[PDB]
Amino acid sequence: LALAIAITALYSIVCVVGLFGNFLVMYVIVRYTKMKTATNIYIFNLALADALATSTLPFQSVNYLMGTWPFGNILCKIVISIDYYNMFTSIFTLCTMSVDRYIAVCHPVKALDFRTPRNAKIVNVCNWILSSAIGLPVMFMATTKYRQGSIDCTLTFSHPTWYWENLLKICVFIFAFIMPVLIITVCYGLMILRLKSVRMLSGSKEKDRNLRRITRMVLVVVAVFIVCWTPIHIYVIIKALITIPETTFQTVSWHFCIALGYTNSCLNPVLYAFLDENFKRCFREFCI
Amino acid sequence: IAQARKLVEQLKMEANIDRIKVSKAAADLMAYCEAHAKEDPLLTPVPASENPF
Amino acid sequence: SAEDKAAVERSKMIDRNLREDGEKAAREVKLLLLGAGESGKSTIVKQMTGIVETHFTFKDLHFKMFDVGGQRSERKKWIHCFEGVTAIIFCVALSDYDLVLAEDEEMNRMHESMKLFDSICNNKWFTDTSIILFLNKKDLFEEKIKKSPLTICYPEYAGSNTYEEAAAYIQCQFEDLNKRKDTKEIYTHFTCATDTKNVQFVFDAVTDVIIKNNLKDCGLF
Amino acid sequence: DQLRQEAEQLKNQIRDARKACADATLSQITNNIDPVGRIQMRTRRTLRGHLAKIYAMHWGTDSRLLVSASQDGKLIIWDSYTTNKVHAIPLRSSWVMTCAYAPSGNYVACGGLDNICSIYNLKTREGNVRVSRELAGHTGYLSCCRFLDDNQIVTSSGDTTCALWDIETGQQTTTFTGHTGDVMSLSLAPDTRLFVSGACDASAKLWDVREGMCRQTFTGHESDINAICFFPNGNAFATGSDDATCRLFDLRADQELMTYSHDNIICGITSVSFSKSGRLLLAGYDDFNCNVWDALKADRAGVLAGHDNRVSCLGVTDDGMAVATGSWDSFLKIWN
Ligand SMILES: CC[C@@H]1CN2CC[C@]3(Nc4cccc(OC)c4C3=O)[C@@H]2C[C@@H]1/C(=C\OC)C(=O)OC
Ligand SMILES: CC(C)CCC[C@@H](C)[C@H]1CC[C@H]2[C@@H]3CC=C4C[C@@H](O)CC[C@]4(C)[C@H]3CC[C@]12C
Ligand SMILES: CC(C)CCC[C@@H](C)[C@H]1CC[C@H]2[C@@H]3CC=C4C[C@@H](O)CC[C@]4(C)[C@H]3CC[C@]12C
């Protein structure tokens, strides 16, 4: 139906934008902004996590247009583990990039000892390792099931099915939305407070222009994260609580809210690389 | 003081030297390059098998 | 290929040492101590060959202060060596306003400080460098302006011959030398004998610079 | 006042003598020789490990090992073939401007704003590089050092003097005075009996090592000379200056033979070296490139454009296989 194509297209565009933006960021980092600074390592990790997250979208896009999962059991475990894995990896990279920018500004003396590129490599690997605390269990449980004459790639839980199914959703709610928002908001909020009292951003008209720019950037990253993830996270919680009748609006909003949580992977390249000051210099060299 | 006197003595030593013409100076430099032109890896790339890099 | 393998292992081993030494050096604060002779460079060290390196730690932060007074050669050839220094500590003796350079009496040695400060502050190597300007000998300067007008050094000065206005005017004249004000900060402190205040000022100014650099590294600024 | 006037007349005499010898120009007699069309040299190695700006590099006489000196306080001996690091010597002073690899390969010399040429013994019994001798006595800054042999090293200082040192005794056997400004560069003649020093007074002085006197003074640069390299036969040298020009100077004609410059080049030359035959003059620039010059035709042969900060140092292997370019970008690149 036209709506299904529209939903499929909305998932496609989010996929194409996400991959093209993230692969571009990784490309520029590999060749121009080497993975020397801690920031670039996080940017590359965020772009890689974002790219892997959005690589699952074509399979979900096909799994929606034709109403069945034609990619088999093995891929289902991969495409759901990559989804669940790259959500927590993408979120924890943002949480690390927030804490990295917070220690930089609020503990600058300690930041020198901790913000080494080596530590960025460790914390990045630790993000991927910890994100296996959900991706691996999801990989085991992400079995393909036959239902109503069509194949559905989903998660299979243990008895009681309610307990583990909601425990995953609750843990996805706490450690992928609540803990991130508190970290991202508190870290960047405390960051802006320090910046409000720093000599090179206060005491002049033009310096205030820079501070407004940094504050706008900080607000926009928090804002984009809240606008992208909150809709789907609450929608998942409401569905797990009460039965919402399936209508032409409930379906569209649901897929839109999923599309929006994947659009944070589409926007992470722009927010953290294309609007990075270091990248603008080196990106200006990019030939196309 | 004695700095000026040294300059004259230095200049006299620098003035009393046998100078050759720039055509024999230039010809010799040209001759050296032609003689060693073949054995100059940066001029004519040697075979890739012979290049240690 | 035991010999070849040992070479790579040796190369990896010193690669680790190079990284380890770089991290130890990356966290060190590098300060370039400048100023004309008798400007208070020696005393500021006490407050904390060719180049004299002074090491001090304050509030868990390690400082490396480099004195280049013994480098009487052309500064333009070696000044770029200190590009990337955290900050420049420029010492100016406030009492120099009433004095003249010994070699030449035409130029006021306070004016020499401004020309020196102007050269360094607007140097193309220090553009994004912050200058901890230390106005030294305030006590001696205060005891002079009571019987010697600041107009001897600044003809355009039209303020009271008191420490508050006179010292402030000298501070403004040095700060006005900074052409690119927006991209460069001048942290001016009137040096005091009380301990933990001159070094505290450097720490506060350097913390601001480190945060500023962190913003550059973080890509925010 | 007679001495100052006599100096001017002697200078005019020297100008008269050189003009008399200037029967033709190097360009005139090289006009018909075949031009080196285009020199496309590629980065074959990239030496990574220096964390600061590299100020100096020096190939060893084996054309395999090279010593690079960085502001990170490290002297790194590289195996250029494998890119391996053989030694990472911790400098007692991080402010280094020059490094020399002894032709024996047993020693490297390091120096800079410490005003000291540090001599390091590479081939110690214990296998650990150690300081053998610290040459003290310059009052400016070590701008350039070169070994004549294991026991002799010639230094150029910001104090406007070059010096010959006896490493075993650590004393200056000969002092080379006459430059007005800081001496920035030093090139030993192939026979090591003469060295030419380029100073900030915009002049190059040819020195007799054994006699300890300036045989000739060369002028023509509008600004300081940061780089000076002997032509392979020792009968000429090339200078690189902040005036964005390289100049070829013939010793026997005692004058400048060629000016290597381009309108698009306005930055200073940091480094100069010749190819093995001397046909190519490689110049490192502040504009982050090295320009390959036709030494005989004063035409830009090609460009080495692999550095993101200014090329600080060049080196051509004694075998002529490769040129090493060190930059303020912390990387050495080997080119062929
Ligand atoms: C790791 C992200 C988990 C787990 N995914 C596994 C399959 C899943 N991906 C889809 C993609 C496109 C359409 C879809 O359905 C119509 C889906 C899905 O159903 C679902 C989504 C979900 C989720 C937010 O997705 C961004 C979330 O829980 O947000 C709070
Ligand atoms: C593809 C998914 C499912 C698995 C990813 C595996 C994890 C371990 C991967 C993904 C991204 C990787 C990182 C990407 C980039 C860097 C920066 C580099 O300077 C050190 C290695 C480091 C830090 C990598 C370590 C391994 C890494 C963390
Ligand atoms: C960050 C901004 C967007 C604020 C957050 C908006 C949240 C609260 C919005 C975005 C999408 C919304 C859902 C969209 C569609 C439906 C179906 C309807 O039959 C019941 C409400 C319900 C389930 C909405 C609940 C509120 C919701 C989750």
Side-chain angles (χ1 to χ4, degrees), chain A residues 1-144 149 151-153 155-158 160-195 197-201 203-242 244-245 247-287, chain B residues 2 4 10-11 15 17 19-23 25-37 39-43 45 47-49 51-53, chain C residues 1-2 4-29 31-37 39-45 47-48 50-59 61-75 77-97 99 102 108-111 113-114 116-127 129-138 140-142 144-146 148-155 157-163 165-179 181-194 197-221, chain D residues 3 6-7 9-14 17-18 20-22 24-33 35-37 39-41 43-91 93-123 127 129 131-167 169-192 194-210 212-221 223-249 251-263 265-307 309-336:
Chain A
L1 188 62
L3 189 71
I5 298 175
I7 293 174
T8 308
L10 178 62
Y11 279 135
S12 296
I13 189 58
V14 176
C15 174
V16 172
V17 173
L19 296 168
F20 194 87
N22 286 290
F23 279 131
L24 191 69
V25 172
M26 290 186 278
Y27 177 76
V28 174
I29 290 169
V30 174
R31 272 208 63 185
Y32 306 144
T33 77
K34 303 298 189 298
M35 263 168 285
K36 281 174 143 49
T37 85
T39 298
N40 291 356
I41 289 169
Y42 298 150
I43 302 286
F44 181 83
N45 175 27
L46 182 63
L48 176 62
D50 291 329
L52 292 172
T54 178
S55 68
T56 53
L57 274 169
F59 301 91
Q60 292 296 341
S61 187
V62 179
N63 183 25
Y64 168 86
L65 187 54
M66 52 167 56
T68 175
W69 182 265
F71 309 115
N73 192 80
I74 299 298
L75 272 173
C76 174
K77 285 176 144 44
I78 304 170
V79 174
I80 301 295
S81 186
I82 288 326
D83 212 294
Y84 268 101
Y85 188 60
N86 289 302
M87 181 177 72
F88 281 75
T89 300
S90 295
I91 295 327
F92 296 162
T93 316
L94 296 183
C95 291
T96 226
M97 289 184 66
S98 184
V99 179
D100 185 64
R101 291 169 170 185
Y102 163 84
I103 300 182
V105 175
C106 300
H107 308 273
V109 173
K110 301 295 180 176
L112 304 175
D113 305 76
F114 296 168
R115 297 195 64 257
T116 67
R118 172 177 181 88
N119 289 117
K121 301 180 193 79
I122 292 178
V123 299
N124 269 4
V125 153
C126 290
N127 174 3
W128 294 97
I129 295 317
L130 180 287
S131 299
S132 84
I134 191 168
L136 294 176
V138 161
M139 183 129 62
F140 303 152
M141 302 154 50
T143 63
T144 304
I151 295 189
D152 298 323
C153 163
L155 289 171
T156 286
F157 310 86
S158 180
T161 179
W162 61 270
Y163 167 78
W164 302 98
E165 188 167 14
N166 293 330
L167 174 61
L168 183 61
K169 289 172 182 177
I170 291 170
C171 288
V172 168
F173 182 71
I174 295 187
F175 306 114
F177 183 76
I178 301 295
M179 189 210 70
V181 165
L182 293 189
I183 295 173
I184 299 296
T185 309
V186 167
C187 280
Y188 281 138
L190 293 176
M191 206 195 60
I192 291 165
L193 295 186
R194 258 298 314 176
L195 295 182
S197 54
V198 66
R199 183 74 88 82
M200 30 69 68
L201 300 167
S204 170
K205 167 198 164 191
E206 192 62 18
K207 294 194 297 181
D208 294 328
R209 192 91 72 91
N210 291 338
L211 190 68
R212 212 195 311 109
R213 201 201 63 259
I214 299 172
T215 307
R216 282 205 214 280
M217 176 61 68
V218 156
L219 294 189
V220 171
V221 291
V222 181
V224 167
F225 183 95
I226 298 305
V227 170
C228 286
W229 281 116
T230 313
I232 184 57
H233 273 97
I234 295 171
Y235 211 145
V236 163
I237 296 285
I238 296 182
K239 276 197 179 183
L241 289 181
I242 62 186
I244 310 304
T247 56
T248 188
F249 170 91
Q250 184 273 292
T251 306
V252 166
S253 49
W254 175 255
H255 292 292
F256 180 89
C257 283
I258 298 166
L260 240 186
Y262 276 112
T263 290
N264 199 63
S265 266
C266 296
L267 297 182
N268 288 339
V270 302
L271 296 188
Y272 294 96
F274 304 154
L275 300 184
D276 180 315
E277 307 305 340
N278 299 339
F279 273 60
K280 282 199 193 78
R281 306 157 205 160
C282 301
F283 182 89
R284 200 176 312 100
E285 184 186 29
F286 176 77
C287 298
Chain B
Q10 176 61 32
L11 286 168
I17 56 104
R19 290 186 182 61
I20 74 179
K21 290 274 170 299
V22 169
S23 287
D28 295 11
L29 292 178
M30 275 184 49
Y32 187 91
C33 292
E34 292 188 16
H36 302 74
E39 68 215 58
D40 197 332
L42 299 180
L43 273 180
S49 185
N51 175 14
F53 301 96
Chain C
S1 64
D4 206 331
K5 180 65 176 303
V8 165
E9 285 297 313
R10 174 175 180 79
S11 183
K12 295 285 163 293
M13 188 167 199
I14 53 202
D15 273 22
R16 290 192 299 280
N17 290 327
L18 291 181
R19 195 199 67 260
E20 176 138 342
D21 296 338
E23 288 183 356
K24 205 188 74 56
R27 62 175 58 100
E28 291 279 327
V29 169
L31 300 178
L32 175 64
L33 180 58
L34 292 172
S39 62
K41 294 146 60 60
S42 54
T43 175
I44 280 301
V45 181
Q47 296 285 27
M48 243 65 42
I51 178 176
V52 184
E53 186 170 15
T54 293
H55 205 101
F56 62 106
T57 293
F58 188 68
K59 288 182 160 63
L61 180 55
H62 280 247
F63 290 88
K64 243 154 58 170
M65 194 169 64
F66 309 103
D67 195 342
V68 293
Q71 192 56 232
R72 314 297 164 87
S73 62
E74 301 292 355
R75 189 181 296 108
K77 308 307 296 184
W78 56 263
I79 193 58
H80 51 56
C81 290
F82 297 95
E83 189 182 11
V85 82
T86 314
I88 293 166
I89 298 169
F90 208 104
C91 295
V92 178
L94 290 159
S95 52
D96 275 359
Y97 85 104
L99 304 184
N108 187 332
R109 60 200 315 177
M110 174 65 70
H111 271 237
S113 293
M114 302 207 317
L116 183 66
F117 187 98
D118 185 303
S119 65
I120 306 311
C121 182
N122 295 314
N123 186 320
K124 71 187 196 301
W125 302 121
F126 292 129
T127 64
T129 308
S130 286
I131 304 171
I132 302 167
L133 173 54
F134 273 144
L135 304 174
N136 296 98
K137 296 174 176 294
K138 75 182 186 302
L140 176 59
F141 170 80
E142 180 164 347
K144 289 189 178 182
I145 54 181
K146 60 173 61 162
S148 182
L150 188 67
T151 53
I152 186 179
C153 180
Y154 302 102
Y157 179 61
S160 64
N161 293 343
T162 186
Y163 170 82
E165 276 201 332
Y169 185 87
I170 299 171
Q171 171 181 14
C172 290
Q173 296 328 297
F174 278 97
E175 293 178 24
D176 275 10
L177 295 169
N178 174 208
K179 298 183 184 301
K181 286 190 177 180
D182 313 72
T183 59
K184 176 177 286 281
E185 294 295 322
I186 290 70
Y187 302 69
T188 303
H189 182 247
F190 287 95
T191 71
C192 41
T194 46
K197 278 176 177 173
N198 293 306
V199 68
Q200 178 69 45
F201 186 87
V202 177
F203 179 91
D204 301 339
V206 164
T207 298
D208 188 289
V209 167
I210 293 168
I211 296 164
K212 178 207 74 179
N213 290 336
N214 287 341
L215 288 168
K216 267 77 176 180
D217 214 65
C218 286
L220 298 168
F221 199 123
Chain D
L3 301 183
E6 186 182 7
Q9 289 168 265
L10 285 163
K11 302 247 289 181
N12 272 12
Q13 177 191 340
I14 295 164
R18 299 172 175 176
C21 290
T25 59
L26 179 56
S27 297
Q28 284 172 310
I29 78 152
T30 69
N31 183 18
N32 279 12
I33 77 178
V36 301
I39 298 295
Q40 278 125 334
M41 295 167 65
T43 300
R44 309 317 183 109
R45 302 291 187 275
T46 303
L47 303 192
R48 309 185 162 84
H50 269 333
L51 302 175
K53 308 191 309 195
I54 303 171
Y55 274 54
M57 80 77 40
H58 200 237
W59 285 103
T61 49
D62 68 338
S63 299
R64 185 183 152 103
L65 300 182
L66 67 82
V67 57
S68 84
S70 172
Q71 297 301 67
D72 62 7
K74 259 76 171 65
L75 221 57
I76 297 171
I77 310 295
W78 306 80
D79 179 351
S80 191
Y81 290 179
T82 68
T83 307
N84 287 336
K85 301 183 185 57
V86 186
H87 301 285
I89 309 172
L91 301 177
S93 176
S94 70
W95 316 101
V96 60
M97 316 185 77
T98 180
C99 55
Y101 214 135
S104 77
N106 315 337
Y107 299 99
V108 290
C110 199
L113 303 176
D114 61 331
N115 306 13
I116 295 167
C117 190
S118 291
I119 309 298
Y120 302 91
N121 193 341
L122 296 178
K123 298 167 193 170
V129 176
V131 178
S132 47
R133 198 81 61 218
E134 283 195 352
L135 308 176
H138 277 322
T139 62
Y141 59 77
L142 263 290
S143 71
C144 190
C145 58
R146 287 287 174 269
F147 292 90
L148 295 70
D149 62 11
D150 273 2
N151 196 32
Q152 284 193 126
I153 188 160
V154 53
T155 64
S156 62
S157 171
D159 68 13
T160 74
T161 81
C162 308
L164 175 65
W165 300 79
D166 177 4
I167 294 166
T169 62
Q171 304 306 319
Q172 297 195 24
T173 51
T174 302
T175 303
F176 300 90
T177 62
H179 274 302
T180 306
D182 305 4
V183 197
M184 307 310 308
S185 48
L186 228 47
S187 191
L188 292 177
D191 61 6
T192 61
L194 309 174
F195 73 94
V196 293
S197 65
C200 275
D201 59 16
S203 78
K205 287 180 165 292
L206 180 69
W207 308 88
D208 196 287
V209 172
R210 294 166 298 190
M213 62 83 66
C214 175
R215 298 229 168 286
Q216 312 181 230
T217 297
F218 305 80
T219 71
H221 275 312
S223 78
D224 323 308
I225 310 170
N226 322 310
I228 194 166
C229 193
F230 259 103
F231 190 80
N233 72 16
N235 297 332
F237 66 94
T239 36
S241 36
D242 288 308
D243 78 359
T245 276
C246 279
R247 290 158 195 292
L248 183 63
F249 289 99
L251 297 188
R252 292 175 300 166
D254 181 65
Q255 52 205 123
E256 177 202 303
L257 296 177
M258 193 82 92
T259 287
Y260 313 86
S261 63
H262 199 53
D263 300 336
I265 301 177
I266 61 185
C267 67
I269 293 77
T270 71
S271 44
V272 284
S273 180
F274 280 99
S275 55
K276 203 181 197 310
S277 77
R279 182 56 182 281
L280 302 179
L281 176 59
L282 304 306
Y285 289 76
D286 309 359
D287 71 354
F288 307 173
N289 295 10
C290 163
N291 279 303
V292 183
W293 293 100
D294 192 334
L296 297 182
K297 309 196 71 168
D299 271 330
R300 206 219 296 264
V303 186
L304 312 186
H307 283 293
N309 207 345
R310 37 188 263 178
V311 170
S312 55
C313 48
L314 283 170
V316 180
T317 49
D318 281 327
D319 66 6
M321 286 305 314
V323 60
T325 304
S327 173
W328 275 4
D329 81 356
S330 87
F331 297 117
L332 297 114
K333 296 196 153 183
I334 308 305
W335 311 70
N336 289 87

